[PDB]
Protein backbone atom coordinates (compact mmCIF):
# COMPACT_ATOMS: atom_id res chain seq x y z
CA UNK A 1 0.00 0.00 0.00
CA UNK A 2 0.85 3.69 -0.24
CA UNK A 3 -0.26 7.07 1.07
CA UNK A 4 -0.93 10.41 -0.61
CA UNK A 5 -2.33 13.30 1.41
CA UNK A 6 -3.98 16.04 -0.63
CA UNK A 7 -5.87 19.21 0.10
CA UNK A 8 -9.25 20.15 -1.35
CA UNK A 9 -8.98 23.90 -0.83
CA UNK A 10 -11.56 25.93 1.05
CA UNK A 11 -14.19 26.41 -1.65
CA UNK A 12 -16.50 23.62 -2.79
CA UNK A 13 -15.20 21.41 -5.60
CA UNK A 14 -13.29 24.00 -7.61
CA UNK A 15 -10.30 24.89 -5.44
CA UNK A 16 -8.71 21.42 -5.47
CA UNK A 17 -5.84 21.04 -7.90
CA UNK A 18 -6.21 18.98 -11.07
CA UNK A 19 -3.65 16.37 -9.98
CA UNK A 20 -5.06 16.18 -6.44
CA UNK A 21 -8.56 15.48 -7.76
CA UNK A 22 -7.10 12.70 -9.92
CA UNK A 23 -5.48 11.11 -6.86
CA UNK A 24 -8.86 11.01 -5.09
CA UNK A 25 -10.58 9.57 -8.17
CA UNK A 26 -8.13 6.68 -8.57
CA UNK A 27 -7.67 5.84 -4.86
CA UNK A 28 -8.61 2.51 -3.31
CA UNK A 29 -9.98 4.34 -0.26
CA UNK A 30 -10.27 7.95 0.91
CA UNK A 31 -10.15 9.34 4.45
CA UNK A 32 -11.83 12.74 4.48
CA UNK A 33 -12.05 15.80 6.72
CA UNK A 34 -14.16 18.39 4.91
CA UNK A 35 -15.85 21.64 6.04
CA UNK A 36 -19.48 20.67 5.40
CA UNK A 37 -21.96 18.25 3.87
CA UNK A 38 -21.90 19.82 0.41
CA UNK A 39 -18.16 19.13 0.21
CA UNK A 40 -18.76 15.60 1.50
CA UNK A 41 -21.37 14.84 -1.18
CA UNK A 42 -18.99 16.07 -3.88
CA UNK A 43 -16.23 13.80 -2.58
CA UNK A 44 -18.46 10.73 -2.43
CA UNK A 45 -19.47 11.17 -6.07
CA UNK A 46 -15.77 11.38 -6.96
CA UNK A 47 -15.00 8.16 -5.06
CA UNK A 48 -17.65 6.32 -3.00
CA UNK A 49 -15.08 4.58 -0.75
CA UNK A 50 -14.81 7.34 1.85
CA UNK A 51 -14.19 7.01 5.58
CA UNK A 52 -15.04 10.26 7.38
CA UNK A 53 -12.38 11.21 9.93
CA UNK A 54 -15.00 13.41 11.64
CA UNK A 55 -16.24 10.33 13.52
CA UNK A 56 -13.11 10.33 15.71
CA UNK A 57 -13.85 13.74 17.23
CA UNK A 58 -15.45 13.93 20.67
CA UNK A 59 -19.13 13.00 20.36
CA UNK A 60 -21.99 13.98 22.67
CA UNK A 61 -20.58 16.32 25.35
CA UNK A 62 -17.86 13.76 26.01
CA UNK A 63 -14.46 14.98 27.25
CA UNK A 64 -11.70 14.04 24.81
CA UNK A 65 -8.22 15.44 24.26
CA UNK A 66 -7.89 16.43 20.62
CA UNK A 67 -4.50 14.67 20.54
CA UNK A 68 -6.30 11.38 21.14
CA UNK A 69 -8.63 12.28 18.28
CA UNK A 70 -5.70 12.82 15.90
CA UNK A 71 -3.96 9.62 16.99
CA UNK A 72 -7.07 7.64 16.08
CA UNK A 73 -7.24 9.45 12.73
CA UNK A 74 -3.58 8.68 12.02
CA UNK A 75 -3.99 5.05 13.09
CA UNK A 76 -7.09 4.61 10.92
CA UNK A 77 -5.22 5.99 7.91
CA UNK A 78 -2.22 3.72 8.47
CA UNK A 79 -4.42 0.63 8.88
CA UNK A 80 -5.63 0.95 5.29
CA UNK A 81 -2.04 1.45 4.11
CA UNK A 82 -0.75 -1.53 6.10
CA UNK A 83 -3.59 -3.65 4.71
CA UNK A 84 -2.30 -2.90 1.19
CA UNK A 85 -4.70 -0.19 -0.01
CA UNK A 86 -3.64 2.66 -2.27
CA UNK A 87 -4.80 5.23 0.26
CA UNK A 88 -5.57 8.95 -0.06
CA UNK A 89 -6.19 11.40 2.77
CA UNK A 90 -8.32 14.32 1.58
CA UNK A 91 -8.13 17.24 4.02
CA UNK A 92 -9.62 20.68 3.45
CA UNK A 93 -7.32 23.53 2.48
CA UNK A 94 -3.63 22.59 2.49
CA UNK A 95 -3.09 19.26 4.28
CA UNK A 96 0.17 20.29 5.95
CA UNK A 97 -0.76 23.86 6.96
CA UNK A 98 -1.67 23.99 10.65
CA UNK A 99 -2.68 20.33 10.45
CA UNK A 100 -0.83 17.43 12.03
CA UNK A 101 -2.75 14.31 10.93
CA UNK A 102 -1.16 14.14 7.48
CA UNK A 103 2.38 14.94 8.65
CA UNK A 104 2.09 12.28 11.36
CA UNK A 105 0.60 9.77 8.92
CA UNK A 106 3.40 10.35 6.40
CA UNK A 107 6.12 10.12 9.05
CA UNK A 108 4.63 6.88 10.38
CA UNK A 109 4.12 5.38 6.91
CA UNK A 110 7.69 6.22 5.88
CA UNK A 111 9.08 4.61 9.04
CA UNK A 112 7.17 1.37 8.38
CA UNK A 113 8.48 1.20 4.81
CA UNK A 114 5.51 2.56 2.86
CA UNK A 115 5.53 5.13 0.07
CA UNK A 116 4.01 8.35 1.42
CA UNK A 117 3.87 11.90 0.09
CA UNK A 118 2.02 15.19 0.56
CA UNK A 119 0.52 17.25 -2.25
CA UNK A 120 0.26 20.99 -1.46
CA UNK A 121 -3.13 22.66 -1.46
CA UNK A 122 -4.71 26.09 -1.24
CA UNK A 123 -4.89 27.06 2.43
CA UNK A 124 -6.92 29.63 4.33
CA UNK A 125 -3.87 31.90 4.34
CA UNK A 126 -3.73 31.75 0.54
CA UNK A 127 -7.42 32.66 0.46
CA UNK A 128 -6.83 35.65 2.75
CA UNK A 129 -4.18 37.31 0.56
CA UNK A 130 -6.56 37.11 -2.41
CA UNK A 131 -9.71 38.18 -0.55
CA UNK A 132 -8.11 41.16 1.21
CA UNK A 133 -5.82 42.19 -1.65
CA UNK A 134 -2.76 41.79 0.59
CA UNK A 135 0.59 40.44 -0.60
CA UNK A 136 2.58 38.83 2.26
CA UNK A 137 5.71 40.25 0.63
CA UNK A 138 4.64 43.89 0.88
CA UNK A 139 5.91 44.32 4.46
CA UNK A 140 6.40 40.69 5.51
CA UNK A 141 4.21 38.06 7.11
CA UNK A 142 4.05 36.19 10.43
CA UNK A 143 1.79 33.28 11.36
CA UNK A 144 1.31 31.73 14.79
CA UNK A 145 -1.30 29.51 16.36
CA UNK A 146 -3.08 31.73 18.87
CA UNK A 147 -2.67 29.49 21.92
CA UNK A 148 1.02 28.86 21.25
CA UNK A 149 1.46 32.64 21.07
CA UNK A 150 0.01 32.81 24.59
CA UNK A 151 1.63 29.72 26.09
CA UNK A 152 5.15 30.32 24.76
CA UNK A 153 7.40 33.30 24.05
CA UNK A 154 6.82 34.71 20.57
CA UNK A 155 7.83 38.24 19.55
CA UNK A 156 5.91 39.61 16.55
CA UNK A 157 7.36 42.13 14.11
CA UNK A 158 4.77 44.97 14.16
CA UNK A 159 5.62 46.01 10.58
CA UNK A 160 4.28 42.76 9.11
CA UNK A 161 0.85 41.31 8.53
CA UNK A 162 0.35 39.05 11.55
CA UNK A 163 -1.99 36.05 11.60
CA UNK A 164 -3.21 34.24 14.71
CA UNK A 165 -4.76 30.94 13.67
CA UNK A 166 -7.41 29.10 15.70
CA UNK A 167 -8.25 32.34 17.48
CA UNK A 168 -11.58 30.88 18.64
CA UNK A 169 -9.79 28.53 21.07
CA UNK A 170 -7.03 30.96 22.08
CA UNK A 171 -5.89 29.96 25.56
CA UNK A 172 -7.99 26.77 25.75
CA UNK A 173 -5.18 24.77 27.34
CA UNK A 174 -6.97 21.44 27.86
CA UNK A 175 -7.75 20.89 24.15
CA UNK A 176 -11.12 19.45 25.17
CA UNK A 177 -13.42 22.41 24.44
CA UNK A 178 -14.66 23.69 21.09
CA UNK A 179 -14.17 27.37 22.04
CA UNK A 180 -12.33 29.58 24.53
CA UNK A 181 -13.76 32.22 26.91
CA UNK A 182 -14.02 36.00 26.82
CA UNK A 183 -11.61 36.44 29.73
CA UNK A 184 -8.99 34.42 27.84
CA UNK A 185 -9.36 36.71 24.82
CA UNK A 186 -9.05 39.74 27.10
CA UNK A 187 -5.71 38.39 28.34
CA UNK A 188 -4.66 38.03 24.70
CA UNK A 189 -5.58 41.67 24.07
CA UNK A 190 -3.47 42.78 27.03
CA UNK A 191 -0.57 40.61 25.83
CA UNK A 192 -0.91 42.04 22.32
CA UNK A 193 -0.94 45.57 23.79
CA UNK A 194 2.85 45.29 24.16
CA UNK A 195 3.00 45.94 20.40
CA UNK A 196 -0.46 47.04 19.21
CA UNK A 197 -2.66 49.85 20.60
CA UNK A 198 -6.08 49.01 21.98
CA UNK A 199 -7.79 50.89 19.14
CA UNK A 200 -5.64 49.15 16.51
CA UNK A 201 -7.91 47.78 13.80
CA UNK A 202 -7.80 44.00 13.37
CA UNK A 203 -9.74 41.78 10.98
CA UNK A 204 -11.67 38.59 11.70
CA UNK A 205 -11.40 36.67 8.42
CA UNK A 206 -13.33 33.60 7.29
CA UNK A 207 -12.80 32.32 3.75
CA UNK A 208 -15.99 31.15 2.08
CA UNK A 209 -16.71 27.43 1.74
CA UNK A 210 -19.55 27.75 -0.81
CA UNK A 211 -19.59 29.59 -4.17
CA UNK A 212 -22.70 31.61 -3.20
CA UNK A 213 -21.07 32.80 0.03
CA UNK A 214 -19.15 35.99 0.66
CA UNK A 215 -16.07 35.83 2.91
CA UNK A 216 -16.18 37.22 6.42
CA UNK A 217 -14.01 40.34 6.60
CA UNK A 218 -14.98 41.98 9.89
CA UNK A 219 -12.93 44.99 11.00
CA UNK A 220 -12.93 46.00 14.67
CA UNK A 221 -10.59 47.58 17.24
CA UNK A 222 -8.37 45.12 19.07
CA UNK A 223 -10.09 46.00 22.36
CA UNK A 224 -13.43 44.62 21.11
CA UNK A 225 -12.06 41.15 20.29
CA UNK A 226 -13.28 39.41 23.51
CA UNK A 227 -16.89 40.36 22.69
CA UNK A 228 -16.72 39.21 19.07
CA UNK A 229 -18.49 36.20 17.56
CA UNK A 230 -15.68 33.77 16.73
CA UNK A 231 -15.98 30.40 15.01
CA UNK A 232 -13.56 27.46 14.63
CA UNK A 233 -12.90 28.56 11.02
CA UNK A 234 -11.99 32.11 12.11
CA UNK A 235 -8.50 33.54 11.62
CA UNK A 236 -7.44 36.83 13.23
CA UNK A 237 -5.40 39.22 11.07
CA UNK A 238 -3.46 42.03 12.74
CA UNK A 239 -2.22 44.56 10.14
CA UNK A 240 1.02 46.47 10.69
CA UNK A 241 1.16 49.06 13.46
CA UNK A 242 4.23 50.55 11.82
CA UNK A 243 5.49 51.37 8.53
CA UNK A 244 8.82 50.24 7.33
CA UNK A 245 11.77 52.32 8.52
CA UNK A 246 15.21 52.42 6.96
CA UNK A 247 17.95 50.11 8.24
CA UNK A 248 20.81 52.60 8.15
CA UNK A 249 23.27 50.16 9.75
CA UNK A 250 23.03 47.74 6.81
CA UNK A 251 22.60 50.45 4.16
CA UNK A 252 25.96 51.82 5.31
CA UNK A 253 27.59 48.39 5.00
CA UNK A 254 26.12 48.18 1.50
CA UNK A 255 27.62 51.61 0.83
CA UNK A 256 24.27 53.11 -0.14
CA UNK A 257 21.58 55.31 1.36
CA UNK A 258 17.81 55.69 1.04
CA UNK A 259 17.46 57.77 -2.11
CA UNK A 260 19.75 55.23 -3.88
CA UNK A 261 17.11 52.51 -3.53
CA UNK A 262 15.49 51.67 -6.85
Amino acid sequence: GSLVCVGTGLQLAGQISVLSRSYIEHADIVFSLLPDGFSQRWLTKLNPNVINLQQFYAQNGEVKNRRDTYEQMVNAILDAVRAGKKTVCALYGHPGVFACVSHMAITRAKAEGFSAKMEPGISAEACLWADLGIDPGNSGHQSFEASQFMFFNHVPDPTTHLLLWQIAIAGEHTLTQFHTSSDRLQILVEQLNQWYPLDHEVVIYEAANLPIQAPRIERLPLANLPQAHLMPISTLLIPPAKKLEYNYAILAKLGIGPEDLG
Binding site: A13, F38, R41, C100, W165, N209, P211, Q213
Partner: protein, 55 residues
Protein backbone atom coordinates in the same frame (compact mmCIF):
# COMPACT_ATOMS: atom_id res chain seq x y z
CA UNK B 1 -29.06 22.41 -4.18
CA UNK B 2 -25.87 20.37 -3.86
CA UNK B 3 -25.82 19.75 -7.62
CA UNK B 4 -26.00 23.47 -8.40
CA UNK B 5 -23.30 24.44 -5.89
CA UNK B 6 -20.89 21.78 -7.16
CA UNK B 7 -21.33 22.95 -10.77
CA UNK B 8 -21.05 26.61 -9.77
CA UNK B 9 -17.83 26.06 -7.82
CA UNK B 10 -16.12 24.28 -10.73
CA UNK B 11 -17.46 26.02 -13.83
CA UNK B 12 -16.11 29.47 -14.59
CA UNK B 13 -18.72 29.90 -17.31
CA UNK B 14 -21.52 29.44 -14.81
CA UNK B 15 -19.69 31.42 -12.15
CA UNK B 16 -19.57 34.51 -14.35
CA UNK B 17 -23.18 33.87 -15.38
CA UNK B 18 -24.14 33.75 -11.69
CA UNK B 19 -22.32 36.96 -10.80
CA UNK B 20 -24.09 38.83 -13.62
CA UNK B 21 -27.57 37.82 -12.42
CA UNK B 22 -27.59 35.63 -9.28
CA UNK B 23 -31.38 35.38 -8.92
CA UNK B 24 -31.95 34.50 -12.58
CA UNK B 25 -29.28 31.78 -12.57
CA UNK B 26 -30.54 30.34 -9.28
CA UNK B 27 -34.14 30.27 -10.51
CA UNK B 28 -32.97 28.73 -13.79
CA UNK B 29 -31.39 25.89 -11.79
CA UNK B 30 -34.55 25.29 -9.77
CA UNK B 31 -33.72 26.80 -6.38
CA UNK B 32 -36.76 27.62 -4.25
CA UNK B 33 -37.56 31.09 -2.96
CA UNK B 34 -36.48 30.19 0.57
CA UNK B 35 -33.26 28.72 -0.84
CA UNK B 36 -32.68 31.90 -2.86
CA UNK B 37 -33.54 34.02 0.18
CA UNK B 38 -31.04 32.02 2.24
CA UNK B 39 -28.36 32.77 -0.35
CA UNK B 40 -29.05 36.50 -0.60
CA UNK B 41 -29.02 36.96 3.20
CA UNK B 42 -25.93 34.79 3.70
CA UNK B 43 -27.61 32.23 5.99
CA UNK B 44 -25.42 29.16 5.50
CA UNK B 45 -27.10 27.37 8.43
CA UNK B 46 -30.47 27.36 6.68
CA UNK B 47 -28.88 26.25 3.40
CA UNK B 48 -27.46 23.14 5.08
CA UNK B 49 -30.84 22.59 6.74
CA UNK B 50 -32.55 22.89 3.35
CA UNK B 51 -30.14 20.33 1.88
CA UNK B 52 -10.03 20.96 11.76
CA UNK B 53 -10.79 22.32 15.27
CA UNK B 54 -7.07 22.41 16.22
CA UNK B 55 -3.81 21.86 14.31
Amino acid sequence: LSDFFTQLGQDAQLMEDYKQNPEAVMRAHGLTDEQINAVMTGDMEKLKTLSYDVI
